[PDB]
Each structure stands twice: as structure tokens, then as C-alpha cells.
Amino acid sequence: KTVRWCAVSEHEATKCQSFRDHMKSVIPSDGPSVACVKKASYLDCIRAIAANEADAVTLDAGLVYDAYLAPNNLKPVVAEFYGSKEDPQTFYYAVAVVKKDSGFQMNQLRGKKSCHTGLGRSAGWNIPIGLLYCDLPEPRKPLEKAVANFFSGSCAPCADGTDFPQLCQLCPGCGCSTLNQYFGYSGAFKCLKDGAGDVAFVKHSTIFENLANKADRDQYELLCLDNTRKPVDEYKDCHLAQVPSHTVVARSMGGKEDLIWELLNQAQEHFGKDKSKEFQLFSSPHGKDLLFKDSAHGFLKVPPRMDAKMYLGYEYVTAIRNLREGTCPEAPTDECKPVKWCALSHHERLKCDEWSVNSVGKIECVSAETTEDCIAKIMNGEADAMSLDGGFVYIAGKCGLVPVLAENYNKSDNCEDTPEAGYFAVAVVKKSASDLTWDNLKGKKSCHTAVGRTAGWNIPMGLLYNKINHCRFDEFFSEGCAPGSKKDSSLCKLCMGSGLNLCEPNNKEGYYGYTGAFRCLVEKGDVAFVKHQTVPQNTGGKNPDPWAKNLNEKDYELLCLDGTRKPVEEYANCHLARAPNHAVVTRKDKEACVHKILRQQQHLFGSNVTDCSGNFCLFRSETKDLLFRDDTVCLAKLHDRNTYEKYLGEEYVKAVGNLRKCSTSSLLEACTFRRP
């Protein structure tokens, strides 16, 4: 129940011993305890933790990468933040500030003039040079010279002015102190402001400290990785890298992550930032930043699904990898790199393999255990693309990935250029129902197609969430039939079909499905949640069966979320949410290649050629829906709907968002932490 903290210096160990002590005084002898293992350096601390001779240490982003690498394999368990918990600042963004209308993007930096905070610094050197690495001229070692030739001239504080002069061209001597006006963050920004340099590599907040007036700021832009610019305040959605400020790592297996959280959580409680002048956790008389930076305000537990690569982030890991390794592709230069497609099942891997061979290298396969694991892989580069359903296009989007092509199902001869939007989920009731309105449903009787389903649950049950704020849905409706709820719940008390299949999510449950929930409306409930076509299909006699043969379309009305009502006829203006088609998602940096490669593939192996017999077919499956949905006609180009927020639709996103409040998703809670 004790946590062995690692200190990299006598001072730090003294502070640690104080920590240990003041944590004994009032903290049940059943509550966490601190032991102090003293090591000579960070690497020795990282090693101690992996060799199970210590348990935790706090490191800068760079050592968080090192700690993650074999054979240590350590992960981020607790984070240090710098604001209020309303605006807990745990990250910071390495951004590239430039002057408005100077016309050039990240990939057009050769020749330009650079301003770096200081050589060896994070945001100001390691990250930018890292990414830029493959664009530097060989020999790339020594690095300093190679950067000197890349740029036309720059101000690289602390660089070797003597040997590679052009690096102090904007600041002769390269002074490594405030003496040199272009040193440090502000020094680098000023280098840009004074117009000595074209681009200045600094922190996101750097410009917000050198220009108090939005007016002047509006004259500066930030270079983004997809070779486009954006307003300095849109840094979160345009930066070279996202860096964790200060992180606490542990072992990946074992590691006592939970115990560690229980320690520091309480610690920050008894000695938080004001909590006491007896013992200050984020400061010391013996020094500064001992154990934890002094600027700290508190701690935050890191979602368990997270690994260093996820925590550090794609861009960051990319930058550091290059520096650490140095490995470029003197391969073509423009010819698209093969698309690695992630498979979910054995049968998926098998179909993907058949596909890979037939594509002749343009398609490759990667196998992950679950949809979320595939998403983590597309996230960190181990994989590039895969098709997802609404719920996952949402999750994937929270994680930074983006929808690129949507799966099309209907109107077949115009396909390739017209993204389908979906099938409107509508709430239904009988016109002969008393004033029933959207915001009136409480205590009513419900009819659902089945729990978990989109049109009959997630969407409706998802919007209704803002009218409760708790996940106990069975106790909102007086009663109802929701195939799948617990056999006893109120959601099961209106379901017919007896025996073992009472309230079961299969057709043996009469009230199951679209048609089934309608019958459930007609025979026991006042509200049914289906889709826009469900009624026209089950009226006008279009349905033989007893209970339906005489039902008439006009005897019903679908509820509109603004309280009013409208005719089943114009569902288009009175639905709950749209409900999308499956979409291929991929990383922003691979978006281009995915379009080119897939269009050419759906060409060669699409629904076009029907001789699936003696050749390959992208849309047919040995099993069922492998890789794509079998009823897929083509992959549409999501022209401008290329972001989950623009492809899903506010209503849908609102709902799905609300539901993930009830059903966790470790991957989502992790991506949320890094950004949302």
C-alpha cells in the first residue's frame, strides 16, 4: 500500500522525505504512504521503476518518450496541471507563428528565415526540426549544419555561431541569454515581429504574451501540418505538436497506477496550493521544481486506456522519432504510400488479404483486437484506414481522425459523387393521442426497436437525456417494450411473445424491430421510435398481417423536438436526428492517399464487375459485411463534410455524446482528456 517515489537529487529527496512525513500525520494508517528512493538521474529513475526498485517519477515530455521505449515500457498515470480545474492546463502546443499573407506553408519552409527560442529547446527546436527532418539536405549529421543549409538564415540561440554562421544571421553571436534580443520565447517572436525572420517556432501562448491587442495579433497566422494556415487562437486545431507539461509515469504491467493516484490525489488535497502553509507540495525552500514543477496547481488521473504514444500524440512522436532515429524515404516523393487497412476479425483479415494481393500492393492489412484498438492504431500510425459506423465515427473524431469517404447504399447510377445523409429517425404517436409532444413523454408508454439500436434507442433515448441527467432509462417511461432491457425492467413489461423470448432482441419477439415497435404503438403504447419510412410501409394495406392490414397512414403523427407536431408525410422537417452511413476514417495526413487509392480500388473491384466468381469483389463477404457493408454501392467523396462534426450532424452528435455518458468507452475517455 506504499509508493516508492524516485528522486534525482539530494534536495529532491529531502523534499520527498518531508512529503513522506507530512503524509503520515492524519492519513489513516490504511491510506497511501511514501517511500523515497534516491537515484542519480532521470534515466536511472526510469530504470529503477522498470526494475521494480521504485514506482513513480515525474518527467518532461521527452523523457516520457524515453521511458516508454523498451525495455522500460513505462506509461503516464497522473498529470500535473497549471490553471484552475475549470481550465486545467496540462498540455501546451508547439506552434509555428508567421506573418499574415506571407504565402507559404510548412512544406514550403526551405529557403525561408527562421526564429528559434533556443537550440535544444522543445517547441523552439526539437519539434520543428524533428518534423522538418526529412526535408533537410544530406548529410543530416551534424544536425546543426543541415538546418543551417535548409533555412536561408535564422536566429538559433546557443547554436555554434563559429562553425555554422547562418544560424546567428538574425542574431549574431547566438547569445544564449536575454542579452541577445532574439533569445527565448519572446525573443524569438520579436525576431518575427521585427521582420528579421519569416517564421518563429514558439509556444501557442507565446504571441498572447507579446501582443496585448487582438488587433495587432490578427496580423499573425499559424502554420498547420496539413499545409494550411489559421488564426493564432485556433492553435488547438493547428500546431506542430501537443506536449504534456509534466507527467508521472509508472510500469505498464504492475506499476501501482491506482495506488499512485490515491496518494497524489490526497496529497494535493492536504497540501494543494493554499491547502496549507505547513507543507507546500508545489514548492520548497531547498529549491525549485523539486519532485514536481512549482508552477503546478494540481493533479489529474490519466485514463487507463492510454499509452505513451497516445499521450504524447502522433505529431510529437513523429518529430522525436526522426530526431532519435533519422530515417527518410528516398523513395519516389509523391507516389502514394500503400494504405494499411485494419481488420477486426479473422474473417476480416482473410478478406483483406485477398484484397491486398489483388490490389497489388496499394492495400496492406493490419490486425487489431477490437474496433477501438484499430482506432488507436490509425491514430498512432500502425494503421491508416477502416470503415466505421456513426458511433465510432464520433469516437474516432474525438480522437482526431476524420471521415474521408462515406458508404453509399441507394440511388445507384450517380453514386461516386453524392454523399448520402441518412434515414431520419422519427418519433411516432397516434393523432388521437392527447396533446402528446416531445417534451411531454415522461411517464408515458414507450415502444423501441431494441436497446442499443440507432433509430429506436440511441438517437431518441439520447436527446431525452437532457431531460433527466442520469442513466436509469427504464424509470422515465411508465412502461414499455425495449427488446434487450433486463427481463424485469419496465422496458420489458409491454413486450409480447412469451416463453424464453419474452422481450428478446429477435423476431420471435413480436414487438421487436421497426415494424415490431409500430405494432407495439398500435397495440399498447403511445410513442414509437422508428425511421421515416416505417409507417408508409406499414399502412395503406402495404402490410397484409392482421393487426396492420387496416391501419391508415394519416391516423398518425411524428413528434418534432421543438414541441410541435407534423404529418408522417414530411418527416424531412420533423425528425429527431439523421442517422448516418458507415464512413472510412483515416488520419488527416493520409486523407489524400486514401481518396486516390480507394477510388481506383472501388473501380477495379467495386459493385461494377459482378464476376465475384473468378476474381475479387470489394463489397461481397464470405461471412457478412467484411470491411464494408455488403449493400455498399460505392465510396462517396465527403467533399466538405470531412470532419465528424460536419458529417454526423449536431442532433446526432448531441445524442451519441449524451449516451457515451452512460456507456463508457475507455478509448473515448482518453481522447477526451488529451483534448475535449
UniProtKB/Swiss-Prot annotation:
- Domain of life from the UniProt record: Eukaryota
Disulfide bond annotation, renumbered to this chain: 6-45, 16-36, 115-191, 134-328, 155-171, 158-176, 168-174, 224-238, 336-593, 342-374, 352-365, 399-671, 415-634, 447-520, 471-662, 481-495, 492-503, 560-574, 612-617
Glycan attachment positions = 29, 410, 469, 608
Q: Coiled coil where?
A: none
Q: Name one Pfam family in it.
A: Transferrin
Any single Gene Ontology cellular-component annotation: endocytic vesicle
Which positions in this protein are listed as binding Fe(3+) 2? 389, 423, 514, 582
Positions bound to Fe(3+) 1: 60, 92, 185, 246
Q: Which PROSITE patterns match?
A: TRANSFERRIN_LIKE_1, TRANSFERRIN_LIKE_2, TRANSFERRIN_LIKE_3, TRANSFERRIN_LIKE_4
- Let me know which tissues express this protein, per UniProt: Expressed by the liver and secreted in plasma.
Purpose of the protein: Transferrins are iron binding transport proteins which can bind two Fe(3+) ions in association with the binding of an anion, usually bicarbonate. It is responsible for the transport of iron from sites of absorption and heme degradation to those of storage and utilization. Serum transferrin may also have a further role in stimulating cell proliferation.
Associated condition reads: Atransferrinemia: A rare autosomal recessive disorder characterized by abnormal synthesis of transferrin leading to iron overload and microcytic hypochromic anemia.
The record's similarity note reads: Belongs to the transferrin family.
Output this protein's name: Serotransferrin
Organism of derivation: Homo sapiens
